[PDB]
Amino acid sequence: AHHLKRGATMNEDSNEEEEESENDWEEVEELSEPVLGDVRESTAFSRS
Amino acid sequence: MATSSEEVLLIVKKVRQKKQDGALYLMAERIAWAPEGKDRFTISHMYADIKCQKISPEGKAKIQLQLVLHAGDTTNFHFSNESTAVKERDAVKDLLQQLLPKFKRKAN
């Protein structure tokens, strides 16, 4: 099919904001590590 | 190590924004982009302001990454690097989404 953005000549001069498939992205979201305690190295202090 | 230093964690090549030639550099807490072969950066966003990022999958003539900022902004990055376009796309994706909630400044 055709690209849903460029319907006619608008910026084919510099080719900047005229056409782009910006309506088809696998939307990625802020991913965090599953942690329930930030003490895995501090606990390995062994002794003081 | 994430100490407000310009430590580029990931160096991405031939990245185009709206087809504009450039290079994408992922630092410790900020992601910046500057035209390829140019010393002056034009795009600079903090992970803190970015909420998420979407990646334009195969099937298109260009593999890309759009940055969705929780401030109401979006940055379309086209990976025009024939060598590692798709590969860089996912590496950037991961690194970015991994750091995204780590520097989240939306707690305000």
mmCIF file with all atom_site columns, C-alpha atoms in Angstrom:
data_model
loop_
_atom_site.group_PDB
_atom_site.id
_atom_site.type_symbol
_atom_site.label_atom_id
_atom_site.label_alt_id
_atom_site.label_comp_id
_atom_site.label_asym_id
_atom_site.label_entity_id
_atom_site.label_seq_id
_atom_site.pdbx_PDB_ins_code
_atom_site.Cartn_x
_atom_site.Cartn_y
_atom_site.Cartn_z
_atom_site.occupancy
_atom_site.B_iso_or_equiv
_atom_site.pdbx_formal_charge
_atom_site.auth_seq_id
_atom_site.auth_comp_id
_atom_site.auth_asym_id
_atom_site.auth_atom_id
_atom_site.pdbx_PDB_model_num
ATOM 1   C CA . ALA A 1 1   ? 0.000  0.000   0.000  1.00 0.00 ? 1   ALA A CA 1
ATOM 2   C CA . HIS A 1 2   ? 0.991  3.666   0.038  1.00 0.00 ? 2   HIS A CA 1
ATOM 3   C CA . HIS A 1 3   ? 2.628  5.449   2.967  1.00 0.00 ? 3   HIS A CA 1
ATOM 4   C CA . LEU A 1 4   ? 0.133  7.199   5.236  1.00 0.00 ? 4   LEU A CA 1
ATOM 5   C CA . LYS A 1 5   ? 1.882  10.567  5.430  1.00 0.00 ? 5   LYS A CA 1
ATOM 6   C CA . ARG A 1 6   ? 2.974  11.845  2.023  1.00 0.00 ? 6   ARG A CA 1
ATOM 7   C CA . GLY A 1 7   ? -0.154 12.604  0.035  1.00 0.00 ? 7   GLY A CA 1
ATOM 8   C CA . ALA A 1 8   ? 1.577  15.038  -2.296 1.00 0.00 ? 8   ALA A CA 1
ATOM 9   C CA . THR A 1 9   ? 4.702  17.169  -2.682 1.00 0.00 ? 9   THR A CA 1
ATOM 10  C CA . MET A 1 10  ? 5.210  19.138  0.528  1.00 0.00 ? 10  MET A CA 1
ATOM 11  C CA . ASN A 1 11  ? 8.853  18.852  1.595  1.00 0.00 ? 11  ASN A CA 1
ATOM 12  C CA . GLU A 1 12  ? 10.476 16.666  -1.051 1.00 0.00 ? 12  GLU A CA 1
ATOM 13  C CA . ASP A 1 13  ? 13.082 19.397  -1.300 1.00 0.00 ? 13  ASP A CA 1
ATOM 14  C CA . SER A 1 14  ? 15.004 18.760  1.909  1.00 0.00 ? 14  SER A CA 1
ATOM 15  C CA . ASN A 1 15  ? 13.157 15.499  2.608  1.00 0.00 ? 15  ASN A CA 1
ATOM 16  C CA . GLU A 1 16  ? 12.594 16.275  6.281  1.00 0.00 ? 16  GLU A CA 1
ATOM 17  C CA . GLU A 1 17  ? 9.008  16.381  7.534  1.00 0.00 ? 17  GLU A CA 1
ATOM 18  C CA . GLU A 1 18  ? 7.000  14.956  4.642  1.00 0.00 ? 18  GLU A CA 1
ATOM 19  C CA . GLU A 1 19  ? 6.762  11.177  5.004  1.00 0.00 ? 19  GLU A CA 1
ATOM 20  C CA . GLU A 1 20  ? 7.555  8.646   7.707  1.00 0.00 ? 20  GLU A CA 1
ATOM 21  C CA . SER A 1 21  ? 5.894  5.541   9.140  1.00 0.00 ? 21  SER A CA 1
ATOM 22  C CA . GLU A 1 22  ? 5.432  7.026   12.600 1.00 0.00 ? 22  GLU A CA 1
ATOM 23  C CA . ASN A 1 23  ? 2.213  5.171   13.184 1.00 0.00 ? 23  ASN A CA 1
ATOM 24  C CA . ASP A 1 24  ? 3.741  1.723   13.386 1.00 0.00 ? 24  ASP A CA 1
ATOM 25  C CA . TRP A 1 25  ? 6.143  1.129   16.191 1.00 0.00 ? 25  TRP A CA 1
ATOM 26  C CA . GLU A 1 26  ? 6.412  -1.776  18.582 1.00 0.00 ? 26  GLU A CA 1
ATOM 27  C CA . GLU A 1 27  ? 5.933  0.430   21.583 1.00 0.00 ? 27  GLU A CA 1
ATOM 28  C CA . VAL A 1 28  ? 8.622  -0.217  24.147 1.00 0.00 ? 28  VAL A CA 1
ATOM 29  C CA . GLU A 1 29  ? 8.110  0.851   27.742 1.00 0.00 ? 29  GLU A CA 1
ATOM 30  C CA . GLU A 1 30  ? 10.340 1.632   30.713 1.00 0.00 ? 30  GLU A CA 1
ATOM 31  C CA . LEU A 1 31  ? 11.604 -1.775  31.769 1.00 0.00 ? 31  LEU A CA 1
ATOM 32  C CA . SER A 1 32  ? 12.858 -2.410  35.287 1.00 0.00 ? 32  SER A CA 1
ATOM 33  C CA . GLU A 1 33  ? 14.581 -5.329  36.938 1.00 0.00 ? 33  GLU A CA 1
ATOM 34  C CA . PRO A 1 34  ? 12.439 -7.419  39.332 1.00 0.00 ? 34  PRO A CA 1
ATOM 35  C CA . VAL A 1 35  ? 14.065 -6.728  42.671 1.00 0.00 ? 35  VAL A CA 1
ATOM 36  C CA . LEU A 1 36  ? 12.659 -6.987  46.179 1.00 0.00 ? 36  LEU A CA 1
ATOM 37  C CA . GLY A 1 37  ? 15.790 -6.106  48.103 1.00 0.00 ? 37  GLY A CA 1
ATOM 38  C CA . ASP A 1 38  ? 18.802 -3.996  47.180 1.00 0.00 ? 38  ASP A CA 1
ATOM 39  C CA . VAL A 1 39  ? 21.221 -5.963  49.358 1.00 0.00 ? 39  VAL A CA 1
ATOM 40  C CA . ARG A 1 40  ? 23.119 -8.667  47.470 1.00 0.00 ? 40  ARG A CA 1
ATOM 41  C CA . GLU A 1 41  ? 26.674 -7.374  47.793 1.00 0.00 ? 41  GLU A CA 1
ATOM 42  C CA . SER A 1 42  ? 26.369 -5.444  51.042 1.00 0.00 ? 42  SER A CA 1
ATOM 43  C CA . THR A 1 43  ? 25.349 -8.684  52.727 1.00 0.00 ? 43  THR A CA 1
ATOM 44  C CA . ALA A 1 44  ? 28.579 -10.292 51.517 1.00 0.00 ? 44  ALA A CA 1
ATOM 45  C CA . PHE A 1 45  ? 30.630 -7.960  53.720 1.00 0.00 ? 45  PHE A CA 1
ATOM 46  C CA . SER A 1 46  ? 31.468 -11.082 55.773 1.00 0.00 ? 46  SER A CA 1
ATOM 47  C CA . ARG A 1 47  ? 32.678 -9.040  58.757 1.00 0.00 ? 47  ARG A CA 1
ATOM 48  C CA . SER A 1 48  ? 33.603 -5.554  59.895 1.00 0.00 ? 48  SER A CA 1
ATOM 49  C CA . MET B 2 1   ? 29.381 5.647   36.017 1.00 0.00 ? 1   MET B CA 1
ATOM 50  C CA . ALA B 2 2   ? 26.092 7.568   35.803 1.00 0.00 ? 2   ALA B CA 1
ATOM 51  C CA . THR B 2 3   ? 27.689 10.494  37.602 1.00 0.00 ? 3   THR B CA 1
ATOM 52  C CA . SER B 2 4   ? 26.475 13.295  35.308 1.00 0.00 ? 4   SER B CA 1
ATOM 53  C CA . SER B 2 5   ? 29.426 12.462  33.076 1.00 0.00 ? 5   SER B CA 1
ATOM 54  C CA . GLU B 2 6   ? 29.369 12.362  29.273 1.00 0.00 ? 6   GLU B CA 1
ATOM 55  C CA . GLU B 2 7   ? 30.117 8.647   29.274 1.00 0.00 ? 7   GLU B CA 1
ATOM 56  C CA . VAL B 2 8   ? 28.753 7.238   26.034 1.00 0.00 ? 8   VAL B CA 1
ATOM 57  C CA . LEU B 2 9   ? 27.488 3.760   26.839 1.00 0.00 ? 9   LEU B CA 1
ATOM 58  C CA . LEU B 2 10  ? 26.277 3.064   23.320 1.00 0.00 ? 10  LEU B CA 1
ATOM 59  C CA . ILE B 2 11  ? 27.572 4.617   20.117 1.00 0.00 ? 11  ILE B CA 1
ATOM 60  C CA . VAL B 2 12  ? 25.055 4.302   17.310 1.00 0.00 ? 12  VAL B CA 1
ATOM 61  C CA . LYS B 2 13  ? 25.987 5.211   13.749 1.00 0.00 ? 13  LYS B CA 1
ATOM 62  C CA . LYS B 2 14  ? 24.136 6.557   10.678 1.00 0.00 ? 14  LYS B CA 1
ATOM 63  C CA . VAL B 2 15  ? 20.952 7.595   12.480 1.00 0.00 ? 15  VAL B CA 1
ATOM 64  C CA . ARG B 2 16  ? 18.558 9.924   10.714 1.00 0.00 ? 16  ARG B CA 1
ATOM 65  C CA . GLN B 2 17  ? 15.833 12.021  12.269 1.00 0.00 ? 17  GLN B CA 1
ATOM 66  C CA . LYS B 2 18  ? 13.170 12.757  9.677  1.00 0.00 ? 18  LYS B CA 1
ATOM 67  C CA . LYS B 2 19  ? 15.823 11.523  7.192  1.00 0.00 ? 19  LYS B CA 1
ATOM 68  C CA . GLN B 2 20  ? 18.419 14.000  8.523  1.00 0.00 ? 20  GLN B CA 1
ATOM 69  C CA . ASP B 2 21  ? 21.877 12.374  8.664  1.00 0.00 ? 21  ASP B CA 1
ATOM 70  C CA . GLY B 2 22  ? 23.370 11.940  12.104 1.00 0.00 ? 22  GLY B CA 1
ATOM 71  C CA . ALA B 2 23  ? 24.684 9.663   14.808 1.00 0.00 ? 23  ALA B CA 1
ATOM 72  C CA . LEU B 2 24  ? 22.987 8.616   18.023 1.00 0.00 ? 24  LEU B CA 1
ATOM 73  C CA . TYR B 2 25  ? 25.065 8.641   21.210 1.00 0.00 ? 25  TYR B CA 1
ATOM 74  C CA . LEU B 2 26  ? 23.695 7.093   24.391 1.00 0.00 ? 26  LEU B CA 1
ATOM 75  C CA . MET B 2 27  ? 25.394 8.549   27.462 1.00 0.00 ? 27  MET B CA 1
ATOM 76  C CA . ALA B 2 28  ? 25.001 7.777   31.172 1.00 0.00 ? 28  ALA B CA 1
ATOM 77  C CA . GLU B 2 29  ? 21.723 9.633   31.788 1.00 0.00 ? 29  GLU B CA 1
ATOM 78  C CA . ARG B 2 30  ? 21.227 11.462  28.509 1.00 0.00 ? 30  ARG B CA 1
ATOM 79  C CA . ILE B 2 31  ? 20.678 10.473  24.906 1.00 0.00 ? 31  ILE B CA 1
ATOM 80  C CA . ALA B 2 32  ? 22.050 12.854  22.304 1.00 0.00 ? 32  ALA B CA 1
ATOM 81  C CA . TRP B 2 33  ? 22.114 12.889  18.535 1.00 0.00 ? 33  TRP B CA 1
ATOM 82  C CA . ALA B 2 34  ? 24.285 14.907  16.165 1.00 0.00 ? 34  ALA B CA 1
ATOM 83  C CA . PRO B 2 35  ? 24.656 14.894  12.345 1.00 0.00 ? 35  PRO B CA 1
ATOM 84  C CA . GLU B 2 36  ? 27.216 12.389  11.016 1.00 0.00 ? 36  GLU B CA 1
ATOM 85  C CA . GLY B 2 37  ? 30.566 14.083  10.586 1.00 0.00 ? 37  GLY B CA 1
ATOM 86  C CA . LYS B 2 38  ? 29.465 17.101  12.600 1.00 0.00 ? 38  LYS B CA 1
ATOM 87  C CA . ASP B 2 39  ? 30.789 18.148  16.020 1.00 0.00 ? 39  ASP B CA 1
ATOM 88  C CA . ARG B 2 40  ? 27.664 20.059  17.021 1.00 0.00 ? 40  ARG B CA 1
ATOM 89  C CA . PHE B 2 41  ? 24.875 18.117  18.722 1.00 0.00 ? 41  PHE B CA 1
ATOM 90  C CA . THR B 2 42  ? 21.301 19.069  17.875 1.00 0.00 ? 42  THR B CA 1
ATOM 91  C CA . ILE B 2 43  ? 19.236 16.538  19.814 1.00 0.00 ? 43  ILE B CA 1
ATOM 92  C CA . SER B 2 44  ? 19.649 16.033  23.570 1.00 0.00 ? 44  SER B CA 1
ATOM 93  C CA . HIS B 2 45  ? 17.143 14.304  25.855 1.00 0.00 ? 45  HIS B CA 1
ATOM 94  C CA . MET B 2 46  ? 17.525 13.048  29.385 1.00 0.00 ? 46  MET B CA 1
ATOM 95  C CA . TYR B 2 47  ? 16.311 9.529   30.166 1.00 0.00 ? 47  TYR B CA 1
ATOM 96  C CA . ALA B 2 48  ? 14.553 11.262  33.047 1.00 0.00 ? 48  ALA B CA 1
ATOM 97  C CA . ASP B 2 49  ? 12.200 13.021  30.575 1.00 0.00 ? 49  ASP B CA 1
ATOM 98  C CA . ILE B 2 50  ? 11.679 10.025  28.330 1.00 0.00 ? 50  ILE B CA 1
ATOM 99  C CA . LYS B 2 51  ? 8.742  7.847   29.255 1.00 0.00 ? 51  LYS B CA 1
ATOM 100 C CA . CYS B 2 52  ? 9.074  5.152   26.637 1.00 0.00 ? 52  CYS B CA 1
ATOM 101 C CA . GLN B 2 53  ? 10.231 4.423   23.115 1.00 0.00 ? 53  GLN B CA 1
ATOM 102 C CA . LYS B 2 54  ? 8.623  2.672   20.220 1.00 0.00 ? 54  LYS B CA 1
ATOM 103 C CA . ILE B 2 55  ? 10.408 0.842   17.426 1.00 0.00 ? 55  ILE B CA 1
ATOM 104 C CA . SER B 2 56  ? 9.201  0.699   13.827 1.00 0.00 ? 56  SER B CA 1
ATOM 105 C CA . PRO B 2 57  ? 9.301  -3.010  12.891 1.00 0.00 ? 57  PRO B CA 1
ATOM 106 C CA . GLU B 2 58  ? 10.370 -4.603  9.619  1.00 0.00 ? 58  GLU B CA 1
ATOM 107 C CA . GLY B 2 59  ? 8.129  -4.209  6.603  1.00 0.00 ? 59  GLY B CA 1
ATOM 108 C CA . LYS B 2 60  ? 8.925  -0.551  6.264  1.00 0.00 ? 60  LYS B CA 1
ATOM 109 C CA . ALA B 2 61  ? 11.687 0.842   4.073  1.00 0.00 ? 61  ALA B CA 1
ATOM 110 C CA . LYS B 2 62  ? 13.314 2.135   7.241  1.00 0.00 ? 62  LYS B CA 1
ATOM 111 C CA . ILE B 2 63  ? 13.844 0.560   10.666 1.00 0.00 ? 63  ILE B CA 1
ATOM 112 C CA . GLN B 2 64  ? 13.343 3.260   13.302 1.00 0.00 ? 64  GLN B CA 1
ATOM 113 C CA . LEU B 2 65  ? 13.028 4.190   16.971 1.00 0.00 ? 65  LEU B CA 1
ATOM 114 C CA . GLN B 2 66  ? 10.601 6.873   18.235 1.00 0.00 ? 66  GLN B CA 1
ATOM 115 C CA . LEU B 2 67  ? 11.228 8.376   21.677 1.00 0.00 ? 67  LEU B CA 1
ATOM 116 C CA . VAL B 2 68  ? 8.035  9.175   23.550 1.00 0.00 ? 68  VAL B CA 1
ATOM 117 C CA . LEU B 2 69  ? 8.709  11.789  26.191 1.00 0.00 ? 69  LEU B CA 1
ATOM 118 C CA . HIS B 2 70  ? 6.236  12.207  29.051 1.00 0.00 ? 70  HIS B CA 1
ATOM 119 C CA . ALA B 2 71  ? 6.533  15.935  28.406 1.00 0.00 ? 71  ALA B CA 1
ATOM 120 C CA . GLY B 2 72  ? 4.561  15.597  25.193 1.00 0.00 ? 72  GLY B CA 1
ATOM 121 C CA . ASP B 2 73  ? 7.464  15.100  22.802 1.00 0.00 ? 73  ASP B CA 1
ATOM 122 C CA . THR B 2 74  ? 8.467  12.375  20.344 1.00 0.00 ? 74  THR B CA 1
ATOM 123 C CA . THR B 2 75  ? 11.742 11.805  18.492 1.00 0.00 ? 75  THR B CA 1
ATOM 124 C CA . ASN B 2 76  ? 11.789 9.627   15.348 1.00 0.00 ? 76  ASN B CA 1
ATOM 125 C CA . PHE B 2 77  ? 15.215 8.039   14.837 1.00 0.00 ? 77  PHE B CA 1
ATOM 126 C CA . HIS B 2 78  ? 15.751 6.194   11.555 1.00 0.00 ? 78  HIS B CA 1
ATOM 127 C CA . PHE B 2 79  ? 18.539 3.620   11.671 1.00 0.00 ? 79  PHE B CA 1
ATOM 128 C CA . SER B 2 80  ? 20.043 4.181   8.228  1.00 0.00 ? 80  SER B CA 1
ATOM 129 C CA . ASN B 2 81  ? 23.148 2.232   9.198  1.00 0.00 ? 81  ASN B CA 1
ATOM 130 C CA . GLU B 2 82  ? 23.015 -0.626  6.679  1.00 0.00 ? 82  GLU B CA 1
ATOM 131 C CA . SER B 2 83  ? 25.682 -2.473  8.683  1.00 0.00 ? 83  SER B CA 1
ATOM 132 C CA . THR B 2 84  ? 23.797 -2.817  11.986 1.00 0.00 ? 84  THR B CA 1
ATOM 133 C CA . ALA B 2 85  ? 20.474 -0.925  11.509 1.00 0.00 ? 85  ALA B CA 1
ATOM 134 C CA . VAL B 2 86  ? 18.175 -3.620  12.909 1.00 0.00 ? 86  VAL B CA 1
ATOM 135 C CA . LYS B 2 87  ? 20.780 -4.765  15.428 1.00 0.00 ? 87  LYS B CA 1
ATOM 136 C CA . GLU B 2 88  ? 21.380 -1.240  16.748 1.00 0.00 ? 88  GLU B CA 1
ATOM 137 C CA . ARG B 2 89  ? 17.616 -0.682  16.835 1.00 0.00 ? 89  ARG B CA 1
ATOM 138 C CA . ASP B 2 90  ? 17.103 -3.438  19.399 1.00 0.00 ? 90  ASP B CA 1
ATOM 139 C CA . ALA B 2 91  ? 20.273 -2.699  21.361 1.00 0.00 ? 91  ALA B CA 1
ATOM 140 C CA . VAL B 2 92  ? 19.285 0.914   21.712 1.00 0.00 ? 92  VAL B CA 1
ATOM 141 C CA . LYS B 2 93  ? 15.740 -0.159  22.554 1.00 0.00 ? 93  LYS B CA 1
ATOM 142 C CA . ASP B 2 94  ? 16.858 -2.418  25.379 1.00 0.00 ? 94  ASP B CA 1
ATOM 143 C CA . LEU B 2 95  ? 19.486 -0.076  26.811 1.00 0.00 ? 95  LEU B CA 1
ATOM 144 C CA . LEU B 2 96  ? 17.052 2.832   26.646 1.00 0.00 ? 96  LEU B CA 1
ATOM 145 C CA . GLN B 2 97  ? 14.078 1.009   28.183 1.00 0.00 ? 97  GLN B CA 1
ATOM 146 C CA . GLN B 2 98  ? 16.385 -0.412  30.845 1.00 0.00 ? 98  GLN B CA 1
ATOM 147 C CA . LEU B 2 99  ? 17.652 3.031   31.843 1.00 0.00 ? 99  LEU B CA 1
ATOM 148 C CA . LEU B 2 100 ? 14.271 4.713   31.250 1.00 0.00 ? 100 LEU B CA 1
ATOM 149 C CA . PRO B 2 101 ? 12.730 3.858   34.666 1.00 0.00 ? 101 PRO B CA 1
ATOM 150 C CA . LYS B 2 102 ? 16.109 4.245   36.384 1.00 0.00 ? 102 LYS B CA 1
ATOM 151 C CA . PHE B 2 103 ? 16.333 7.961   35.622 1.00 0.00 ? 103 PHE B CA 1
ATOM 152 C CA . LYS B 2 104 ? 12.573 8.498   35.755 1.00 0.00 ? 104 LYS B CA 1
ATOM 153 C CA . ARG B 2 105 ? 12.020 12.092  36.868 1.00 0.00 ? 105 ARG B CA 1
ATOM 154 C CA . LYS B 2 106 ? 8.254  11.831  36.429 1.00 0.00 ? 106 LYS B CA 1
ATOM 155 C CA . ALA B 2 107 ? 7.950  11.598  40.210 1.00 0.00 ? 107 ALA B CA 1
ATOM 156 C CA . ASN B 2 108 ? 6.871  15.230  40.257 1.00 0.00 ? 108 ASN B CA 1
#
